[PDB]
Design a protein around this ligand. Structure first.
Ligand SMILES: OC[C@H]1O[C@@](CO)(O[C@H]2O[C@H](CO)[C@@H](O)[C@H](O)[C@H]2O)[C@@H](O)[C@@H]1O
Ligand SMILES: OC[C@H]1O[C@@](CO)(O[C@H]2O[C@H](CO)[C@@H](O)[C@H](O)[C@H]2O)[C@@H](O)[C@@H]1O
Length: 382
């Protein structure tokens, strides 16, 4: 056999290792060895691997990081193999995910999946609070007020869970709030972004969200919602299949609340892309693996609760009512997602935003000063 190696963050529950086991069972003369990426310095580790000759054949890379690798020659130009393939057609893909694998008029990967974040809510806790579980909050004011009502320390319940972690988690979570209020990563210090960050300060200062929001991932925050310790959670569709098993209450999912009545919806485009490292010894076989993964996209939601990056395969209902309502909400919120970049310097942009969030939420800097600082850094890097 040709043996390939593949790196991804995906858990044993999530697509990559399962798709690999299925692929390997084909006995087609190619075998894939999986390694789950550890430690949250994926980008630097993977570039260092590439530079030293330790890179895998295939990686699932977060979409905002793609351009850094593509621009630096680390990824194989798959333009011609995509063209030749009938399994992978660029016309099948949503435009934002497709653009994220592109650099200088070439394709340097194939989208794996797409997502964004939305607002999960525990309908049983809404009901017990005297709220209307059919009417979740629509505006930031409503969201904060609901969170105040639902915060019940005597019962170990925070009103909301989210992530402000000093890595991509925090940037991905914060950008929707800034964007809805009129800002972007290219202009992150508008009055509306300050209001967004003041709103996050309210959630922490008033103890409506755990202090651990400053250091905890979206996945680990949402575990607290699933256990009944947070009444609402901002997270993505990657939570659904675990939530169905773990949450022992009735729940819904709605669009992210907007800053003033009828202000616009917005959020950041999530999820990963497949890529082949440029010095692979097995380019054709690596690409055939990716073709196999793409051929399973039609089953991704039903099997993993994740969403393909494709307009050719609109996602059908599963038959599970909670999951199917979640699907509706995420498909709707996805219509408002915006790309982080393209930028070969995304990590530096994101670090500036992370530091602003940490500075304001810790009380070390005012929200205005924190975001002004970020905007000056971003001007230089971007
Ligand atoms: O946050 C939603 C929650 O707030 C209540 C009032 O406590 O309703 C508010 O939000 C609704 C949803 O947008 C509005 O229709 C309503 O006008 C507003 O007061 C609860 O009814 C609801 O569960
Ligand atoms: O298996 C990967 C794991 O990462 C997640 C959640 O962290 O990635 C989402 O959130 C990131 C920020 O932490 C975004 O940058 C990324 O684009 C988005 O997909 C999940 O997808 C998944 O559980």
């Amino acid at each position: 056999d040709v043996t390939l190696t593949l790196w991804s963050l995906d858990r044993d529950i999530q697509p990559a290792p399962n798709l690999i086991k299925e692929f390997n069972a084909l006995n087609n003369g190619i075998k894939i060895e999986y390694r789950q990426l550890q430690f949250d310095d994926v980008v630097s580790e993977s570039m260092r691997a590439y530079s030293t000759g330790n890179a895998p054949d295939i990686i699932a890379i977060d979409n905002p990081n793609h351009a850094m690798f593509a621009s630096r020659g680390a990824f194989l130009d798959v333009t011609d193999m995509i063209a030749k393939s009938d399994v992978i057609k660029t016309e099948n893909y949503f435009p934002g995910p497709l653009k994220s694998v592109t650099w200088d008029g070439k394709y340097f990967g194939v989208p794996k999946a797409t997502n964004t974040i939305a607002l999960y809510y525990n309908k049983d806790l809404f009901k017990a609070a005297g709220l209307d579980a059919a009417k979740p909050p629509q505006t930031w004011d409503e969201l904060v007020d609901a969170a105040r009502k639902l915060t019940n320390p005597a019962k170990n319940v925070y009103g909301i869970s989210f992530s402000a972690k000093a890595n991509e988690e925090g940037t991905f979570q914060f950008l929707p709030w800034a964007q809805m209020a009129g800002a972007t990563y290219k202009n992150i210090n508008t009055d509306g972004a300050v209001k967004a960050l003041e709103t996050w300060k309210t959630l922490l200062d008033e103890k409506l969200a755990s202090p651990d929001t400053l250091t905890r991932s979206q996945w680990d925050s949402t575990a607290t919602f699933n256990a009944g310790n947070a009444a609402m959670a901002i997270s993505g569709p990657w939570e659904i299949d675990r939530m169905l098993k773990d949450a022992k209450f009735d729940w819904g999912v709605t669009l992210l609340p907007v800053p003033t009545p009828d202000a616009p919806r917005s959020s950041a485009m999530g999820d990963y892309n497949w890529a082949i490292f440029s010095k692979t010894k097995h380019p054709a076989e690596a690409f055939k693996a990716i073709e196999f993964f793409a051929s399973k996209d039609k089953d991704m939601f039903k099997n993993f609760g994740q969403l393909p990056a494709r307009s050719d395969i609109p996602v059908p209902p599963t038959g599970n009512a909670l999951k199917d309502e979640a699907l509706k909400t995420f498909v709707e919120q996805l219509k408002y997602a915006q790309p982080r970049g393209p930028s070969p310097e995304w990590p530096k942009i994101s670090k500036a935003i992370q530091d602003a969030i940490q500075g304001a939420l810790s009380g070390q800097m005012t929200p205005k000063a924190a975001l002004d600082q970020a905007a000056e850094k971003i001007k230089l890097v971007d």
